[PDB]
Design an enzyme around this catalytic site. Sequence first.
Site, mmCIF file in Angstrom:
data_model
loop_
_atom_site.group_PDB
_atom_site.id
_atom_site.type_symbol
_atom_site.label_atom_id
_atom_site.label_comp_id
_atom_site.label_asym_id
_atom_site.label_seq_id
_atom_site.Cartn_x
_atom_site.Cartn_y
_atom_site.Cartn_z
ATOM 1 C CD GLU A 19 -3.063 -0.628 -0.001
ATOM 2 O OE1 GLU A 19 -2.738 0.252 -0.846
ATOM 3 O OE2 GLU A 19 -4.151 -1.272 -0.052
ATOM 4 C CG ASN B 166 -8.493 6.731 -4.371
ATOM 5 O OD1 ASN B 166 -7.550 5.999 -4.641
ATOM 6 N ND2 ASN B 166 -8.877 6.972 -3.113
ATOM 7 C CG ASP C 196 -13.487 8.244 -5.341
ATOM 8 O OD1 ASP C 196 -14.079 7.637 -4.435
ATOM 9 O OD2 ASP C 196 -12.330 8.657 -5.199
ATOM 10 C CB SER D 86 -11.820 9.342 -2.160
ATOM 11 O OG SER D 86 -11.295 8.363 -3.051
ATOM 12 C CG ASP E 76 -6.199 5.550 -1.334
ATOM 13 O OD1 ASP E 76 -7.371 5.468 -0.880
ATOM 14 O OD2 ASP E 76 -5.857 5.136 -2.468
ATOM 15 C CG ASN F 171 -10.921 6.270 0.281
ATOM 16 O OD1 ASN F 171 -10.419 6.311 -0.848
ATOM 17 N ND2 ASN F 171 -12.057 6.882 0.589
#
EC number: 3.2.1.17
Length: 129
Positions: free
Chosen positions: A35, A46, A48, A50, A52, A59
């Site tokens: 990750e 992301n 969308d 959002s 991370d 998120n």
Amino acid sequence: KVFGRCELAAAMKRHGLDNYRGYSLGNWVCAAKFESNFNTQATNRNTDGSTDYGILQINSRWWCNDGRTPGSRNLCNIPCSALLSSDITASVNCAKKIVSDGNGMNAWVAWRNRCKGTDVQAWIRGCRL
Ligand SMILES: [Au+]
Ligand SMILES: [Cl-]
Ligand SMILES: [Cl-]
Ligand SMILES: [Cl-]
Ligand code: NA
């Protein structure tokens, strides 16, 4: 902060992540690895909108608030910037919440595609735990 493999394992255990919800320490580390590559300051955007954050790429849609993720939640009740700290306590408490949400560690797409079913144990081989 970029952790050492064995160093993060220790930290993760001290904070009781080792075997939390039945996921062995080695799973948690394999996740961190893919990750964030062990870097507490990792952020990835992301499509969308959002974002991370952290060693576990938590998120902003549900877990933390960044004040820029339209219509999201902050279920861990923390500014996403607490997840970028050198002290991993916060990421760890939010992960406990995330992993307990019904889908276990699949919540981390990287874990499912790169850790699930692999010899996760290798991740802690050698560490003084
Ligand atoms: Au810690
Ligand atoms: Cl927001
Ligand atoms: Cl720490
Ligand atoms: Cl599970
Ligand atoms: Na939020």
